[PDB]
Every structure is written in C-alpha cells, then in structure tokens.
C-alpha cells in the first residue's frame, strides 16, 4: 500500500527516496507506481514544448510551462536549454570551436568538477563513423575529447549486466546480474525484465558508484529514469539539480537513453529507420551542452558518453531448436535467445543427465550455430561461471543466431531484426566511449578497453576511493590529464631458492630412463655458465615473475630457458624462453622419444616420477620448454629434465605439440622474435583465482602430482617489429591464451582433421589478458622493463581478439 494522498509540491525529483506508505516524487516512482496524485501535473509539465521561440523571449513567468524563457529563468535554474541562443544572441555549443580545457573553469562554490554519465542503450561502436553526418554534437565531443575506437562490454552483452558492470567495476558473475532472466536456487526466486522481483536488493551485489559516492560524502543524482519521463525532462532535471545550493547539489549524475537499442531490435543495426534515433540522441546531447553552457558549466563538467552493448542482425529464421537435437525436451528449462542456459525442469526428476544433454548437443549437424559447454569449460576471458545463478549447461550462440527450445516458443511466445547478448569479443557487440572535460585529455585517441575499467576512473574523477573491483586501477590513466592514480607494483611474497648440483643420479628412483650416457674444459666451463644463469638475459626479458603468495620454489637456469619450479606442485609455475626470427625447429631424435632425466638440482622427493604416468592409463606428459626449439643437440637434453615435465591428456598433447612445433616458430617469424612464458593453471572451483593445493580435484593416479585445469602462454615481442624481441627499446606487444586442459577435443568439431585446420582456432577462442593469467597463478609479470608502470598495466589488460578491423 502507498497512501498517495500527500503531494509533490516543492518536491519534484527530490533526491532521497522516502519510505512507504508516504507517496514518492523521485525519478523512479512511476516504475514502482507510488507517485503522489499530483506528480504528473507538477513534475511532468509539457506545456509549450522544450524550445524557446522569439516571441517567448522576455515573457512573464507562467509556472505551467515545461520550461521558461522569462528574464528570471537563469536565477530559477529552469530556462529552456536554447534560451540564451534564441533570446540572448548566444551560439549553440556545437557551433563553437573546440578550445582545450586545461583547468576546470567552475562557478564559485563548486568543490570539484561534476561528472555526467550520458549512457546510451544499444549504441554500436561503428555508429561513431557510420552515423557521423547526423551526430554533430556527439562528433564534437569525440573529436575534442578523449575517445576509444570502441569499448568492450562484458558477457552476456545484455543491458542490465553491462550497466551494472559500468556502475560497480565487477564481472556479472560477481555483481550477480548474470542475465536478463535469472533463477536463484538459494532464494528459490526468479528475476525477470518485466516485474517487481528485480527491485529486491538481494539480487544486486557489489558497491555501485552512487553508493561509493554517498559513503564518502559526495552526493549523487539518482541514476535511474522511468521510461515515461521524456528525454527533455531528464536533461532539464539534471540541469535543475546542478543549480541547487552547494551543500545539496550532487557531484555525479546519469542520463539514460533507451535508444538506439529500441529501434535496433525492430529494424536491425543499420536499418534505414536507424538514422532518426541517432539524430534524436545527438539533439539531446546538444540540449545538455547548451544547458551546461548557460550555467557556465561547459568547461567545468566531465562528460562521459558511454554505451552498454552493440546490436547485431538477427531474424526469426536464424533460430536453432533444441527439439531438433533432444528427445526429452520437456524435461528441461531453457533460458533462450543469443545465449542459452539449461537446467532440469524438476529437481525431483533423478533421470535428468547433464552429460547426455551435452553429448546430444555436441557437433550434431555440419553447420550447427551454437556450442554447448559446461560453464567451467567456457573461455576464461568470459569470467562467466562462479555464480549459482549461472546454470551448469551453457550454449554459446553464433553471432546472428538464436537458440530456442521448440518452434512454438518463437511463433507463439517476424517481430525483430536486431539483437545482442553474444560473446563479448564479437565486433557487432562492441560499444562506445568518449570522455570530455577538464580532467580528460584533449583530442586524444586511446586503445580499446573493457568496461570493467571505468568504475575506477569515475572514482578518480570524483576523488573517491573505489571499492574492490575487477578493473586494474591505473590501466586507464592514459585517458586523464590529471587525477591519475599512481599504483605501486605488489610486493613479492616468496623469494626463490637457487639450487646447485646436490643429488647423484642413483638417488633417484623415478622409473625414468633416458639414452643419454654418450658424453673438455672448452664446452664444460660453458654448460656450468648456462646452469648459473649466463644466457638468462636472453630468455628472461622482463625480470622474473613475482610470486605473490607463500610457497617454496626454485629458479632453474638452462641454455635455452629459465623456470620457476614449485616444490609444492612438483612442476614449474612458469617457464620463460626467447625464440628469435632466425631460430630453427628440429625434431625429437628417435632414441630420445621417451627420455626423462632426473634434475640433480632438485631432490627426488620434490620430483615427479615416470611410473605414475605409466600406471595412469588416462594421463600422459608434455614439456613446457619445447624440445623442438632446442638451440643445439646438446642443449636438447635439458628439455627432457623431469623438472620441465607437466601432465597432459593425450588429446591435449595434440594441441600443445602443434603449438610448440609449428605456432611458436610462426609467431617468431611474424613478430621478429618472441618471448614465451608458459605454465600450468589450477582453477578447479572456477572462480578465476589460483587454487590452493587442498582445492585440487585430480592427481596423476597414485601420486601427489596435481593435474592442471588449464595451460597458459604469454607471448611478447616488440611493438615496433623492426626491432627483435630480445633488443626492444620501446613499447611491447603481447598476446596470450589460457587453453583448457581437456581429455577430449569435443569442443573442436574438426578435430579429426589435421591440427592445421583446428588448433589455432581453439587457441584464438581461448585468448586471454595477462591480468587474467595473473589472477589464475598469483604471479606478477613485467616487473623489470624500461616502461612506465601505467603503460605496463595497460599491456596487462590487453586482449588479442582476432576479429577483423571495425
Ligand atoms: C572481481 O572482484 C571481486 C571483488 O574484489 C572479487 O570478489 C571477491 O573475492 C573474494 C574471494 O573469492 C571474496 O572474499 C570472500 O568474502 C566473504 C564475505 O563476503 C560477503 O561480504 C562481502 C563484503 O561486503 C562489504 O564490502 C565493503 C568492504 O569491501 C563493506 O564496507 C560493506 O559494508 C559491504 O557490505 C560481499 O561483497 C559479498 O558479496 C557476495 O555475496 C553476495 C551474496 O552473499 C552477493 O549479493 C554478491 O553479488 C557477492 O557474490 C559473489 O561472491 C561470492 C563470494 O563472496 C560468491 O559466492 C558468488 O558466486 C558471487 O560470485 C558477501 O556478502 C568471506 O566470507 C570469504 O572468506 C572465506 O574464505 C577465507 C579464505 O582465506 C577463509 O579464511 C575464511 O575462513 C572464509 O571461509 C569460510 O567460508 C568458506 C566458503 O563459504 C568455507 O568453506 C570455510 O570452511 C569457512 O567457513 C572471502 O573473503 C569477496 O567476497 C568477493 N567479492 C565480491 C563482490 O564478489 C573477484 O574475486 C574478482 N574476480 C577476479 C576473477 O579477479
Ligand atoms: N546500474 C546501473 C546504471 C549505470 C549507468 Cl552508466 C546508467 C544507468 C541509467 O540507467 C537507467 O536509467 N535505466 C532505466 C531503465 C529502466 N530501469 C528500472 O526501472 C530499474 C532497474 C533496476 C533497479 N534497481 N532498483 N530500482 C531499479 C529500477 C532500468 C533501466 C536502465 C544505470
Ligand atoms: Ca580457483
Ligand atoms: Na625413458
Ligand atoms: Na572434436
Ligand atoms: Zn536490447
């Protein structure tokens, strides 16, 4: 019950949402239906429209009008946005030349430049170029300010997951808004787009920017706007808030446009009908900026123009049906569309089997336009698993397609030509970022970045301390003229041991053999030098990785590679090596095919053993530093050391061998040398963070050798590829991946073909940021370069996406 008998008199768009059953006057009461009886009459005035005309100039104040053109309207903070233009011979903001804003030019009583977040739904990154002719205000913001060619959303690329990521700097898995429809089994409750469950606080985790602001004494405008409040009114409200007294006036504000998403769904992203929504958005921008200029705030406020996601061509005819794959379709519940999530229809049916559902959906038709995954097997770059609202079975749908349970769900539940929600690497899902204002750079382009990073920067812009989030604070300092955040590198927690020769070969009883007893002060002073670290400057180019947790490990040097060898996990945490453009691939000599050699620097009790592999019929082994890339026949023996071995399913050894025998050399040829760091990852609880030893669910049978869930590689080179990787004077270039360590290649539908037709495509799918590998290993990379730490942070957040050029 809301006793709506109170009144909005003097309270229109009041900033504290007062508790029931007193009636409300805030920008959300319509959506809750709790507004006072007189909310429309007093707060949603429309009379005379939104623009001054010549005849209203000077007019006598009439409180009925939507906005005013009377002499006192500036004092009142409620002029029409074009008042000064029509009535006082001023220019529109867009017609003025841009002039660098080197310092904030703020009215008296402003303690900090306000932040206005101008968010647009469904604003595809390519609109900036393709719509440029009809968006002059936006184009001015973009060219005069700081802009990225695009900004990457999170997955799933739906509205609420992305807006609330923008507000919290968290992945959906962590904030808890994981889709537009959700079931939470603990609450036993469902969340939906239409309805009232979605207004319950328990859905929404983290700390959004308006709460961060409030808890630190910065006031905030209310971020949300009911759909029936017109855009003009939203802008006038913001500008009226900006006229409040100092102690009552917010520092941060948001506007939201439901366009161009609304039209995009109906017409497609580039439908002829899409010109007018772009024009209308631009006009709204124009109203804000003319309004700010009237208040003398246009060289004071920092404006961010930001989208939530793009929009792709999707029609009813490109639907796949689960009824064409499964016979028991009535026993499942599907969350459908541009992604799928499947769970059992009833918890009391113990005949439902996830394994057989996945098998029925795997590679069943030649052109199949979705791929099923257990959530923990999704690409790690999606960070889409650690939440109980994410069902175990997920379908990743190809761009331009839908998935549905049965045809009747699509014809009785075509209406639409656009949609979004797909993999956040897809070009059509990318969206926009422009920053304009005293705190942003002038006429600067920056590289694409992910939306998880913007919370930190908004916090910076407002003088706030960010709550703990998934951005990397400092990676976006290059967007800012001032207020940078100057982070320090984390402290190394564990120092390495540097073992020398300590064990005789007969101490080892590992069941390992090698044909290596076929043996000179010349080249034996030489191998002693390689074992003390003499080639290490060539193979460890950016310092040793720091270990950021408590553990016991050894640095091992060799001619061709350096490793950090964990005595706890019995294998390297990391292995580092450099492959020049000139390096040659060699094969594994026949007599060395099964060679494994004890490492006399490491005790038997801290070594793997060959017998465990012999007795584990499921599990084989691989090497981190590849024997194929050995610099010499004699150096090759180092690669067969038991301290360079790692457990690998035979099916995974197909991928890994191709990476090591063919791809590495191809990259070194293309990039003018590469530095490679590779290692294992253990993430059995799928939280994106390094497991402790007591979380490992699988060991090589009979042993304490833990089986990795993933293998990584970080591949670094010179951004200026006319310089070789090992003699680079400036910025670096990186690509990385996090390959799932699976006992089958069911993910790859073409895996019975030659590796040259499928392996690299798998690796592309599992592209990763260095930061993602950091979380997964407790390691910190690039500790010693000649670059600024901020530039390194940016390199660590880079994702190589392998899409074509937008
Ligand atoms: C991306 O960034 C995020 C944010 O930094 C990273 O996520 C963080 O990761 C930490 C490790 O996984 C995790 O620490 C947890 O915290 C547990 C307490 O959590 C509750 O309180 C949180 C704090 O709120 C307050 O925050 C500020 C200060 O920062 C205060 O001033 C305010 O007053 C705030 O109220 C809160 O954030 C958290 O929210 C989650 O849960 C809510 C529902 O309960 C959701 O609404 C919300 O969306 C969050 O949901 C996500 O996270 C949970 C895990 O918390 C997960 O279940 C969901 O799937 C979803 O992903 C909570 O309300 C604390 O209890 C944990 O401690 C245990 O572990 C330590 C290990 O050292 C033990 O020593 C200790 O004994 C304890 O063990 C006991 O429990 C075990 C397991 O239950 C049990 O086995 C054992 O035997 C013991 O009984 C731990 O510290 C942060 O909570 C988490 N934050 C968020 C927001 O998600 C994330 O990792 C990043 N991702 C990547 C890839 O880097
Ligand atoms: N997060 C975030 C965020 C980040 C940025 Cl950058 C911009 C914005 C501006 O978004 C809005 O104006 N929106 C208005 C639309 C309709 N709507 C609701 O009615 C609603 C939804 C959740 C609620 N929880 N509690 N009340 C709620 C009301 C939500 C939609 C989005 C939000
Ligand atoms: Ca983990
Ligand atoms: Na052998
Ligand atoms: Na396959
Ligand atoms: Zn939409």
From Swiss-Prot:
Residues engaged in binding 1-tetradecanoyl-sn-glycerol 3-phosphate: 159, 180, 261, 420
Subcellular locations according to the entry: Secreted
Short sequence motif Cell attachment site: positions: 76-78
GO CC, one annotated term: extracellular space
Activity regulation, per record: Inhibited by vanadate. Inhibited by micromolar levels of bile salts, such as tauroursodeoxycholate. Not inhibited by taurodeoxycholate. Not inhibited by hydroxysterols, such as 7-hydroxycholesterol, testosterone, dexamethasone and prednisolone. Inhibited by EDTA and EGTA.
EC number from the UniProt entry: 3.1.4.39, 3.1.4.4
Annotated site, Essential for catalytic activity, chain positions: 796
Residue span(s) of domain SMB: 4-47, 48-92
Gene3D superfamilies per the UniProt record, alphabetical: 4.10.410.20, Alkaline Phosphatase, subunit A (3.40.720.10), Extracellular Endonuclease, subunit A (3.40.570.10)
Tissues with expression: Abundantly expressed in cerebrum and cerebellum. Localized in secretory epithelial cells in the brain and the eye including choroid plexus epithelial cells, ciliary epithelial cells, iris pigment epithelial cells, and retinal pigment cells.
Taxonomy, superkingdom: Eukaryota
Outcome of substituting residue 261 to N: Abolishes lysophospholipase D activity
Residue span of region Nuclease-like domain: 541-806
Protein name: Autotaxin
Organism: Rattus norvegicus (Rat)
């Amino acid at each position: 019950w809301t006793a709506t008998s109170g009144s909005c008199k003097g309270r229109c768009f009041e900033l504290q949402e007062v508790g029931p059953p007193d009636c409300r006057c805030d920008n959300l009461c319509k959506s809750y239906s709790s507004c006072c009886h007189d909310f429309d009459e007093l707060c949603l005035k429309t009379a005379r429209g939104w623009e001054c005309t010549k005849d209203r100039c000077g007019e006598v104040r009439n409180e009925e009008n939507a906005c005013h053109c009377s002499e006192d309207c500036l004092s009142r903070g409620d002029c029409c946005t074009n008042y000064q233009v029509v009535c006082k011979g001023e220019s529109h903001w867009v017609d003025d030349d841009c002039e660098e804003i080197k310092v904030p030019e703020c009215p008296a009583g402003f303690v900090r430049p306000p932040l206005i977040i101008f968010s647009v739904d469904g604003f595809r990154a390519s609109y900036m170029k393709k719509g440029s002719k009809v968006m002059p205000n936006i184009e001015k913001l973009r060219s005069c300010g700081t802009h990225a060619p695009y900004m990457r959303p999170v997955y799933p690329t739906k509205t609420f997951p992305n807006l609330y990521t923008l507000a919290t700097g968290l992945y959906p898995e962590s904030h808890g808004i994981v889709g537009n429809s959700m079931y939470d089994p603990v609450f036993d409750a469902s969340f939906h787009l239409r309805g009232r469950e979605k207004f319950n606080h328990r859905w929404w985790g983290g700390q959004p920017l308006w709460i961060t602001a409030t808890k630190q004494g910065v006031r905030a405008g209310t971020f949300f706007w009911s759909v029936s409040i017109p855009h003009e009114r939203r802008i006038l409200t913001i500008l009226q808030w900006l006229s409040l007294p100092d102690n009552e006036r917010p520092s941060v504000y948001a506007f939201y446009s439901e366009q161009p998403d609304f039209s995009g769904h109906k017409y497609g992203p580039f439908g002829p009908e899409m010109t007018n929504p772009l024009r209308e958005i631009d006009k709204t921008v124009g109203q804000l900026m003319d309004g700010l200029k009237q208040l003398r705030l246009h060289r004071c406020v920092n404006v961010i123009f930001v989208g939530d996601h793009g929009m792709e061509d999707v029609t009813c005819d490109r639907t796949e049906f689960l009824s064409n794959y499964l016979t028991n379709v009535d026993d499942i519940t599907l969350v459908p569309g541009t992604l799928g999530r499947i769970r059992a229809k009833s918890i009391n049916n113990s005949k439902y089997d996830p394994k057989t559902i996945i098998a029925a959906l795997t590679c069943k038709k030649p052109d199949q336009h979705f791929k099923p995954y257990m959530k923990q097997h999704l690409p790690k770059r999606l960070h889409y698993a650690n939440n109980r609202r994410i069902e175990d079975i997920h379908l990743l749908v190809d761009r331009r397609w839908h998935v549905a349970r049965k045809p009747l769900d699509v014809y009785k539940k075509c209406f639409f030509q656009g949609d979004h929600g797909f993999d956040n690497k897809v070009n059509s899902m990318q969206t926009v970022f422009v920053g304009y204002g005293p705190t942003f750079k002038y006429r600067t382009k920056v590289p694409p970045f992910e939306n998880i990073e913007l919370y930190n920067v908004m916090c910076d812009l407002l003088g706030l301390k960010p709550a703990p989030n998934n951005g990397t604070h400092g990676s976006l300092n290059h967007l800012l003229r001032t207020n940078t955040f100057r982070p320090t590198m984390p402290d190394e927690v564990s120092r390495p041991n540097y073992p020398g020769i300590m064990y005789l070969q007969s101490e080892f009883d590992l069941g390992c053999t090698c044909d290596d007893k076929v043996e000179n002060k010349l080249e034996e002073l030489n191998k002693r030098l390689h074992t003390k670290g003499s080639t290490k400057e060539r193979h460890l180019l950016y310092g040793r990785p720091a270990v950021l947790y408590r553990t016991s490990y050894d640095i091992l040097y060799h001619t061709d590679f350096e490793s950090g060898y964990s005595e706890i996990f019995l294998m390297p945490l990391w292995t580092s090596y450099t492959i020049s453009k000139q390096a040659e691939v060699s094969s594994i000599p026949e007599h060395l095919t099964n060679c494994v050699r004890p490492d006399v620097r490491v005790s038997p009790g801290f070594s793997q053993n060959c017998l465990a592999y012999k007795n584990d019929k499921q599990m084989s082994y691989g090497f981190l530093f590849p024997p194929y890339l050995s610099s010499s026949p004699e150096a090759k023996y180092d690669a067969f050391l038991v301290t360079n071995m790692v457990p690998m399913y035979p099916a995974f050894k197909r991928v890994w061998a191709y990476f090591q025998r063919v791809l590495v050399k191809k990259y070194a040829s293309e990039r003018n040398g590469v530095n490679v760091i590779s290692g294992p990852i253990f993430d059995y609880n799928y939280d994106g963070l390094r497991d402790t030893e007591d979380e490992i669910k699988q060991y090589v049978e009979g042993s304490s050798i833990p089986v990795p869930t993933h293998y990584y590689s970080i591949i670094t080179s010179c951004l200026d590829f006319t310089q070789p990787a090992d003699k680079c004077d400036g910025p670096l270039s990186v690509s990385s991946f996090i390959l799932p360590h699976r006992p089958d290649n069911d993910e790859s539908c073409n895996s019975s073909e030659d590796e040259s037709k499928w392996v690299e495509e798998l690796m592309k799918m599992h592209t990763a940021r260095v930061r993602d590998i950091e979380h997964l290993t407790g390691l910190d990379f690039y500790r010693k370069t000649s670059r600024s730490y901020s530039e390194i942070l940016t390199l660590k957040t880079y994702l190589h996406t392998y899409e074509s050029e937008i």
